[PDB]
Design a protein around this ligand. Structure first.
Ligand SMILES: O=c1cc(-c2ccccc2)c2cc(Cl)c(O[C@@H]3O[C@H](CO)[C@@H](O[C@@H]4O[C@H](CO)[C@@H](O)[C@H](O)[C@H]4O)[C@H](O)[C@H]3O)cc2o1
Ligand SMILES: *[C@@H]1O[C@H](CO)[C@@H](O)[C@H](O)[C@H]1NC(C)=O
Ligand SMILES: *[C@@H]1O[C@H](CO)[C@@H](O)[C@H](O)[C@H]1NC(C)=O
Ligand SMILES: *[C@H]1O[C@H](CO)[C@@H](O)[C@H](O)[C@@H]1O
Ligand SMILES: *[C@H]1O[C@H](CO)[C@@H](O)[C@H](O)[C@@H]1O
Ligand SMILES: *[C@H]1O[C@H](CO)[C@@H](O)[C@H](O)[C@@H]1O
Ligand SMILES: *[C@H]1O[C@H](CO)[C@@H](O)[C@H](O)[C@@H]1O
Ligand SMILES: *[C@H]1O[C@H](CO)[C@@H](O)[C@H](O)[C@@H]1O
Ligand SMILES: *[C@H]1O[C@H](CO)[C@@H](O)[C@H](O)[C@@H]1O
Ligand SMILES: *[C@H]1O[C@H](CO)[C@@H](O)[C@H](O)[C@@H]1O
Length: 363
């Protein structure tokens, strides 16, 4: 059954899409031989989230759900995993991941049409349980990054757009997780309560949507889930892993009106601990990382619904070419792997790095 109560990951199996599988098989494997080539083929089996970073990706969302329907009637029981990520004036704190819609060019109205498009696909496939991460970095940027003019002038649009996303996708087969940054971002004691207030306000302002399950953490980041020793670059923060973050912000969400909020955590680039990060704020194509804890609903945690792979390992975080569009200085740093292609595009060297440093190992 597509509908659910409680943990939406219980009773289903996350779907490994053909989009990532095509990338690995056609862009990575032809370049690899021997033990590496076989290890790479195994990675394409690991379920990860499909990103709807453009409106042109929604037909591919439908294609993926078409594959799930076929698989479910052949005997299986699979669930869809997608990311809603096409906000007007997207990626307001950086320059690497600016999107197609801008507030000045009717972006809010274009975002609502984008949401309407997704809703129709979700109604078309109401027989399939659909798991969604809502707008990465957006709300986390509104907490700490209002000093950036792009974020400040995007606050009203973000909040109206997110509200439209959580109410229009509030369907019986949907489970939503608002992006909530990570331990190195909002995990700091000073950021915890202001972050909790904002998430709870989004929840309350949308009339407590029953499909809105909770928060997603560490999306496209590198933090360890439950590492016992604090890495050098976490110096000053008692919240140095993802487990500590969710158990801190959790009761704070309840304080501000959001009871029964649960968490998912990205671990697809968290295998090697500590990372090659020279500063904790460095996010672009970070060196010294590997594939981490495999997706599983058996977490052994009171608040974690599932380990997930949101960011598909191999897809770039941003270009290191200073003569290219959308260039961010974060991608030219010593701990950023070079040379790096455009954000979202395939980064061959980075995939090889992730596979070699994988823990659990594929080799
Ligand atoms: O300006 C920032 C700052 C931070 C940050 C703040 C505080 C502490 C540490 C870091 C950022 C952190 C993170 Cl995790 C950021 O995520 C990057 O941005 C996007 C997702 O929001 C990712 O790019 C997208 O990847 C998708 C999947 O491959 C593609 O579909 C999409 O085309 C592409 O835009 C990127 O990989 C993350 O690294 C951004 C921060 O920005
Ligand atoms: C509350 O909802 C309205 C839409 O009804 C939206 O425009 C506004 O941004 C929301 N406020 C907050 C604080 O999220
Ligand atoms: C961390 O979590 C993983 C996966 O749930 C588990 O194998 C390991 O025992 C945990 N370690 C600690 C120290 O809690
Ligand atoms: C999905 O949810 C509905 C209730 O909304 C049930 O009727 C069904 O059995 C399943 O649990
Ligand atoms: C999802 O599908 C997998 C493979 O069929 C199962 O192992 C799991 O129990 C769930 O039904
Ligand atoms: C399968 O999909 C990937 C990602 O779009 C492509 O890179 C590949 O060429 C094939 O079409
Ligand atoms: C791409 O195709 C190859 C061979 O068919 C697989 O090994 C891989 O898992 C991916 O699906
Ligand atoms: C990668 O893309 C090629 C087509 O360019 C396919 O032949 C292959 O199966 C994989 O999807
Ligand atoms: C795979 O990687 C090799 C280098 O290792 C390239 O030459 C090839 O074009 C493909 O990207
Ligand atoms: C990994 O193993 C496969 C066999 O499944 C080989 O075909 C490949 O060459 C690599 O050694």
């Amino acid at each position: 059954t597509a509908t659910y109560s409680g943990n939406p990951f219980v009773g289903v199996t996350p779907w490994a899409n053909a989009y990532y599988a095509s990338e690995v098989s056609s862009l990575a494997i032809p370049s690899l031989t021997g033990a590496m080539a076989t290890a790479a083929a195994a990675v394409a089996k690991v379920p990860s989230f499909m990103w709807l970073d453009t409106l042109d990706k929604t037909p591919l969302m439908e294609q993926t759900l078409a594959d799930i329907r076929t698989a479910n009637k052949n005997g299986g029981n699979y669930a869809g995993q997608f990311v809603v990520y096409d906000l007007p004036d997207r990626d307001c704190a950086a320059l690497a991941s600016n999107g197609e819609y801008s507030i000045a060019d009717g972006g809010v109205a274009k975002y609502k049409n984008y949401i309407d498009t997704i809703r129709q696909i979700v109604v078309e496939y109401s027989d399939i349980r659909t798991l969604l991460v809502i707008e990465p970095a957006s709300l986390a940027n509104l907490v700490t990054n209002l000093g950036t003019p792009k974020c400040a002038n995007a606050q009203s649009a973000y909040l109206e757009c997110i509200n439209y996303a959580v109410t229009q996708l509030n369907l019986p087969n949907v489970a939503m997780y608002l992006d909530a940054g990570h331990a190195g971002w909002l995990g700091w004691p000073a950021n915890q309560d202001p972050a909790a207030q904002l998430f709870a306000n989004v929840y309350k302002n949308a009339s407590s949507p029953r499909a809105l399950r909770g928060l997603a953490t560490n999306v496209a980041n590198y933090n360890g889930w439950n590492i016992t020793s604090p890495p050098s670059y976490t110096q000053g923060n008692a919240v140095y892993n993802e487990k500590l973050y969710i158990h801190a912000i959790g009761p704070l969400l309840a304080n501000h009106g959001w009871s029964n909020a649960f968490f998912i955590t990205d671990q697809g680039r968290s295998g090697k601990q500590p990372t090659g990060q020279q500063q904790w704020g460095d996010w672009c194509n970070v060196i010294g990382t590997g594939f981490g804890i495999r997706p599983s609903a058996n977490t052994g945690d009171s608040l974690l619904d599932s380990f997930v792979w949101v960011k598909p390992g191999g897809e770039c975080d941003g270009t290191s070419d200073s003569s290219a569009p959308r260039f961010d200085s974060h991608c030219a740093l010593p701990d950023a792997l070079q040379p790096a292609p455009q954000a979202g595009a395939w980064f061959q060297a980075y995939f090889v790095q992730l596979l070699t440093n994988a823990n659990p190992s594929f080799l």
